[PDB]
Structure formats: structure tokens, C-alpha cells
Amino acid sequence: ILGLQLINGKNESAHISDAVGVVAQAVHELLEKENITDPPRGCVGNTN
Amino acid sequence: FCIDLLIKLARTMNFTYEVHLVADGKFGTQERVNNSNKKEWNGMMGEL
Amino acid sequence: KIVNIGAVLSTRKHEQMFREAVNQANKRHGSWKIQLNATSVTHKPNAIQMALSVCEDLISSQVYAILVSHPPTPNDHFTPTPVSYTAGFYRIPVLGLTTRMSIYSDKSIHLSFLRTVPPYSHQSSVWFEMMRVYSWNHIILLVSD
Amino acid sequence: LNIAVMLGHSHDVTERELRTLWGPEQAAGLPLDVNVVALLMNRTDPKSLITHVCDLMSGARIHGLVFGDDTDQEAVAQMLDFISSHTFVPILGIHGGASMIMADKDPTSTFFQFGASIQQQATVMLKIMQDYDWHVFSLVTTIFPGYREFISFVKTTVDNSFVGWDMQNVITLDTSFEDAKTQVQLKKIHSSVILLYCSKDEAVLILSEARSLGLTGYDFFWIVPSLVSGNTELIPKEFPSGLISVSYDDWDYSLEARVRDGIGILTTAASSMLEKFSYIPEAKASCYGQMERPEVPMHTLHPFMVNVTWDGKDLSFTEEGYQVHPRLVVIVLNKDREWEKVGKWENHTLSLRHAVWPRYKSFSDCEPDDNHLSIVTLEEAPFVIVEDIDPLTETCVRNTVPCR
Amino acid sequence: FVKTTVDNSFVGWDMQNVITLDTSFEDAKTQVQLKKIHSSVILLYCSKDEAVLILSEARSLGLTGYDFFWIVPSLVSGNTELIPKEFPSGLISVSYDDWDY
């Protein structure tokens, strides 16, 4: 029968590294953009 | 008459012969399905 | 300056590498603008309790992006849905990396959620990619639903 | 048993001041009549929602949480559906943000809505075109979830029918549509009708951008499903008078009537299950704690919530979570920017009140119109023949004009 | 002159709106009246700097594709060797000789 298997699997460290790199580049672009809304205090009170 | 043409083509291409007829008897003049607008491919062409 | 980028993760060991990772991130694209912070809490037992915590802790710290992984020990019975819901309000993007069952794929019930783990539906693309060059085209399909 | 209601600062402010709903007589014949609980929470904070629901659950064991909102953030409904799964308490939203319908939900939940699916709205929208014979149009669907169910449904219904529409350019514009990605795209459109479908902000931006150049003229009516205008009373200046939009009822069906429609079915559900088997049990005891084992012998009263009739109207729900017979009403702006009416919609018939269209000024302060004439004709045997309408595709054959 | 010539010959000419846009048009004194053009040929005629401004504004949103040829008199491109970065390829502009004569 035709088996199948992925490359990384349970190798979350590399995924974390790549994700934080992509997010860091994206947010470095984002900081040079228009007005960034300040995140609210959280769930309580504000629901805008 | 069509039988001769079928025999010649089949003998050239050397396959089987599974003849039938059409239950209703028609050329597949499609209509809508019962009580619904979906087209019903009835007749010979629809059966094919 | 404090551009908080949280990451809800597995047990402390699997969350340990983040504080080392942020320093490398803080150093590579370094400046006095990107001084990130890291706030994280493991996948708490049950679901409603953690859904309270993600607002009690994460956005209570005014976070900007959320990272989520799979629970360490259990199966996919209780994958984190509320993260896509709690962050669903403010329409902030959420990044998943290991949880994968193809239900999250369509951006209709989960608005905006991108994954670095590809769902099993790509096997169909892989199945096509090899059945093309194998000298057969007609195929029978069997699957649950 | 015990039933609780939930509402906040809606058009009616009495609520608890009103009270006495279902209380004094109503349907007094129901054995073991249930009480009501009045809650007037304003802020729709998520943690607030969970805390309120859990506080109610840990107190008196409710068996119904009919809810209405006043905001427009659609994201609320998904969390009510989510809470239904994790609390086993049935809940029926009525008015506000948590009223609009979305796609299929998990069968484990017990949450239902009061609006109508996009399919019925599209069917009614197309049904208007028949009575006015403007059968030439071109959709504009931007990005929103379900933007392919709408397209596929319209495409299928056009060809499946036999009336003979002429469906022009489809134009599935997307992205930020800031400057140029649509100017070329939104220039090939010349047909007299549009079928826009997007969110409120998207509709505002599109109407503002294409108001000047593309098509807003005397013969450029815009139509759009209920999603764009679902709450009313927050109409911005960009909307042009003359826009049509099928929507769920706003003027009639007062919230007092809606609530009486609400708790009634729960009492009838209790009667039905008592007749089937007298159990009247709890659902999940306490929300919070370490209880994570899904015992769940059954969905309790879920099988009894379908095909429920109460005092006339049949409130039959669908497996997906729609109704079978809604109360859609076709509505339109006017000169003073206030929706009034055009006609009703029965089970499978609209029978709109109006005659041939009044042709409102599809503009604000603008340039006048003069390309409309009122030709008068008689009938002579070989020159102008008058014939009655046909029973099939009931407008007329495709080679004549509306000879009213 | 162009109206007289276009309306006195047989040929079969088909003219359209003229749009005498005015002012310095910082951003929006021309835009609300530039969206109207949808034909295939333009005949812009103005000074060089104004021509650069107009072409940059129009290309940004309006019309520059494979079938939107522009034609301009010599008053824009008269000195040559001064191509800005806004001019689109495929321009046609009569001018006095400089390569020969």
C-alpha cells in the first residue's frame, strides 16, 4: 500500500522561529504605516 | 442500416457489443424535474 | 515600543524557547521601536476557563497578535476554538502552526486565521500530482463525511 | 420551570418597567407555569457575556435565554452558538447584531435565530424583477463570507428558470479597491441594475466611490440583501434614496410581540416533552469547575423544538438553523431618508402594494431627468395588437413591451 | 480648428466630450471630471509640467493599458532628451526634425 508521511511533524521550534521572523518583518513594516489603534484594556467594558 | 456501420467500426476497433433500447422512447428532449426547475435530462441522451 | 506578541502554547518546556527566541528577534530587527514583550499561558484544562483567561491575561495586557499550538497530551477533541472566537471580535490575525483538521480552512466560520501546518486536503493535490504521470486517469473515491 | 430574558437599551426602554409579559394570563393553561427574569445589561463585553451566562446558570437553573442586541458587530452570534454547545441551555436570539444568519453550525449546539438565510433573500430579490421587468443586471460581490454561495445560487437560478434573464458581467472585485484595481473593472458595467452584496463599511465605500462615475442615474436602481441595512436608524449620508433592500421586519412586530412569540414555544416544548416523558431535568448543573466529561445522554429538548406551532403562525426551524416561512418585507428609502414600505411577502407570494414604479430621484441634490415619456396608444388590427399575459413565465414573450 | 475640421470632412468622425479641465488641480479639481472618459484616443494639449502632472494622475487610476494610445502636440515634447519617468511608452507626437536637416 501507498504510505505517506510529512517532513517536520513535531518540530515546533523551527515553526516558532519562522513565524516570529515573519511576524517581526510584518510588524516592522506596520510600525511605518497609518494610525495604529491602541489595543483596549481587554474584554471588560469596551466592545468596539 | 446503422447496424452495418456499427459492425464495421467495432470490427475495426475490436471491442464488445452491448445493445439496448430506450425505455420511454425519445431523443432526450430535456425538461425540468418534477415540481422543481432543475433540468431533467430524460430520454436517450439523458440516460447516456 | 512594547509591541506584545503573545503565544498560547503547550507545557512550560515547549514555551521555554520563546523568551530565547524574542531576544534574537529583538536583536535582528533591532531599534528603539520594536521592544516586544512575551506573555503566555498554557492550554488550561476545559475550554470556557481558558477563554476567560485569554481575555483575563492576554488582551488584558493589550496584545497585538496571538500564536496557538496543539495541546500536548490529549487528542484533537478539544482543539482551541475560542482563540479564533475571542480574537474574532477585534479581527486581529491569529497564527496556528500544528493544529490541523481542515475545518479551520474556510474563512467563513473563523474569519481570519492562517496556519503553517497544511490540512489533509492537500493530499488531493498530491494525489493529482502523481496520478497524472502514472498512465491512469479513471479513479474510484471512498471517504467518510 | 424558570425562563429568563435578556435585552439592552433597545428602542423600547420600559422592559422591566413594562414587565408582566406572559405573566398574568397569556397562555395560562400551561401546567407548571414558568417565571421571567429581567436583565438590562448594556455593554456586550465577551467576558461580561460569559460571566452573566455562568452566573445565571449557577443560580436558578434556566431552560431558555432569549436574547436581543442593539449593536451591529456580527461576531456576537458565533459566541452565542459557542456558549450553547458548552452549556446545553437552548437560546434564541431575536433582534440586533445577534440576529443575522450565518452558515451551518455544530449539531451539538442548541442555538437558533430569527432572520432568514441568504437563499430566500436572493429568491425574493429576484422575484421583484418579474413584476417590474427590468430583467438585465450585473452582480458586484466583494469579499464577505458566503460570497460564493450567493454567486452560485444566482447563476443556477437564472439558468434553471425559463423566464429568460440576461445576466451580464459578474465582476467579483476584491482587495482594498483604493484607486485603480476597480476603475477599469467598474467601467465595463452598463446594465440598469446592480445586486451589490457586502458589509456596511464596504457598501458605504463602494457607494461613495461609484456614485460619481459609474451608474447612479434615473435608470440605475441599486438593490442589496438585508446585510447592508439590518438595524436601521443608523443610515449614513452616502446611501442614495431609491435603494431597495429586502429585510426582516422593523416597523411591525413590536418587541413586545416578539417576546410573546419567544417564551411561548419554550412552554409548548415543555408540554411536548412532558407528554413524551415527564423529566424536566437540568442541563449542565454549574458551568464552571473541573467538569469536562461530556456525559450528554441526549440533546434534551432539541428534538422537540422543531415543527412547533403556537396560536396561528408556524414557527418551524431548519436543521441548519433557519425558519421555513419568514416574514420578509421589501423596504426603500424616500425623500426624507426613512424606509417606509413597498409590499409584503407571504409564504410564496409578495403581492406588492405599489403600481408601476414611482421612479424616485435616485440622487441627492442633482441634475434633473427628462428622458421619461408617457406615450399614449390605441389598438388597430394590423398596427398595434393587444394580448393578455401568458401563464408560463408570466410577464410576456421576449418580443413585446409592457402595454399597461 | 479641430472642431471645424472634424465636422467638415466626410471620413465619418465620431467626437466625444471635450472636458476643459481648469485650475492647478492640487488633487481633486480634475478627478471628479476625469472619470468620464472611456474612449480609446486622447489628445492632451498643455505645458510640459502640467502634462507630467496630468499623465501621472490619469495613469494612476484611469487608462494606460494596451488600447489607450495617447497623442500630443510638439509643445510638450519639443526639446527632446528630457523624458520624465511619468511618460508612457507608445506616445505619438509630431515635432520638427532634429536627426536630419
Swiss-Prot record, chain C:
Post-translational modification comment from the UniProt entry: NMDA is probably regulated by C-terminal phosphorylation of an isoform of GRIN1 by PKC. Its phosphorylated state is influenced by the formation of the NMDAR-PPP2CB complex and the NMDAR channel activity.
**Location(s), subcellular:** Cell membrane; Postsynaptic cell membrane; Postsynaptic density membrane; Synaptic cell membrane
Q: Which residues are glycosylated?
A: N37
Q: What is known of its domains?
A: A hydrophobic region that gives rise to the prediction of a transmembrane span does not cross the membrane, but is part of a discontinuously helical region that dips into the membrane and is probably part of the pore and of the selectivity filter. The extracellular N-terminal domain (NTD) is a site of allosteric regulation to modulate overall receptor function.
* Entry's disease: Neurodevelopmental disorder with or without hyperkinetic movements and seizures, autosomal dominant: An autosomal dominant neurodevelopmental disorder characterized by severe intellectual disability and developmental delay, absent speech, muscular hypotonia, dyskinesia, and hyperkinetic movements. Cortical blindness, cerebral atrophy, and seizures are present in some patients. Neurodevelopmental disorder with or without hyperkinetic movements and seizures, autosomal recessive: An autosomal recessive neurodevelopmental disorder characterized by severe intellectual disability and psychomotor developmental delay, involuntary and stereotypic movements, spasticity, and inability to walk without support. Intractable seizures manifest in some patients.
Q: Briefly, what is this protein's role?
A: Component of N-methyl-D-aspartate (NMDA) receptors (NMDARs) that function as heterotetrameric, ligand-gated cation channels with high calcium permeability and voltage-dependent block by Mg(2+). NMDARs participate in synaptic plasticity for learning and memory formation by contributing to the long-term potentiation (LTP). Channel activation requires binding of the neurotransmitter L-glutamate to the GluN2 subunit, glycine or D-serine binding to the GluN1 subunit, plus membrane depolarization to eliminate channel inhibition by Mg(2+).
Similarity field: Belongs to the glutamate-gated ion channel (TC 1.A.10.1) family. NR1/GRIN1 subfamily.
Q: Under which name does UniProt file this protein?
A: Glutamate receptor ionotropic, NMDA 1
- Per the UniProt entry, what species is this protein from, by scientific name? Homo sapiens (Human)
Q: Which gene encodes it?
A: GRIN1
Parent sequence residues shown: 25 to 169 of 938
Curated annotation (Swiss-Prot), chain D:
Tell me where on the tree of life, at the top rank, the source sits: Eukaryota
Q: What is the effect of changing A210V?
A: In FESD; no effect on function in ion transmembrane transport when expressed in Xenopus oocytes; has no effect on channel basal gating properties and activation by glutamate and glycine
The record gives the effect of mutating N347D as: Found in a patient with neonatal onset epileptic encephalopathy; uncertain significance
Q: Where found?
A: Cell projection, Dendritic spine; Cell membrane; Synapse; Postsynaptic cell membrane
Task: Provide the alphabetized UniProt keywords.
Answer: Calcium, Cell membrane, Cell projection, Chromosomal rearrangement, Cytoplasmic vesicle, Disease variant, Disulfide bond, Epilepsy, Glycoprotein, Ion channel, Ion transport, Ligand-gated ion channel, Magnesium, Membrane, Metal-binding, Phosphoprotein, Postsynaptic cell membrane, Receptor, Signal, Synapse, Transmembrane, Transmembrane helix, Transport, Zinc
A GO molecular-function annotation: amyloid-beta binding
> In the UniProt annotation, what is the result of changing L378Q?
In FESD; uncertain significance
Effect annotated for changing A257V: In FESD; uncertain significance; no effect on function in ion transmembrane transport when expressed in Xenopus oocytes; has no effect on channel basal gating properties and activation by glutamate and glycine
Q: Which residues are glycosylated?
A: N42, N307, N347
Residues holding Zn(2+): H11, H95, E233, D249
GO CC terms in record: cell surface; cytoplasmic vesicle membrane; dendritic spine; endoplasmic reticulum membrane; glutamatergic synapse; NMDA selective glutamate receptor complex; plasma membrane; postsynaptic density
| Intrachain S-S bonds | C54-C287
Q: Which GO terms describe its biological process?
A: brain development; calcium ion transmembrane import into cytosol; calcium ion transmembrane transport; chemical synaptic transmission; directional locomotion; dopamine metabolic process; excitatory chemical synaptic transmission; excitatory postsynaptic potential
Reported effect of changing D219N? Found in a cutaneous malignant melanoma sample; somatic mutation
Q: Which residues lie on this side of the membrane: Extracellular?
A: 1-404
Q: How does it assemble?
A: Heterotetramer. Forms heterotetrameric channels composed of two GluN1/zeta subunits (GRIN1), and two identical GluN2/epsilon subunits (GRIN2A, GRIN2B, GRIN2C or GRIN2D) or GluN3 subunits (GRIN3A or GRIN3B) (in vitro). Can also form heterotetrameric channels that contain at least two GluN1 subunits and at least two different GluN2 subunits (or a combination of one GluN2 and one GluN3 subunits) (in vitro). In vivo, the subunit composition may depend on the expression levels of the different subunits. Found in a complex with GRIN1, GRIN3A and PPP2CB. Found in a complex with GRIN1 and GRIN3B.
Q: Write out the similarity annotation.
A: Belongs to the glutamate-gated ion channel (TC 1.A.10.1) family. NR2A/GRIN2A subfamily.
The protein, known as: Glutamate receptor ionotropic, NMDA 2A
Give from-to of the shown chain within the full protein. 34 to 437 of 1464
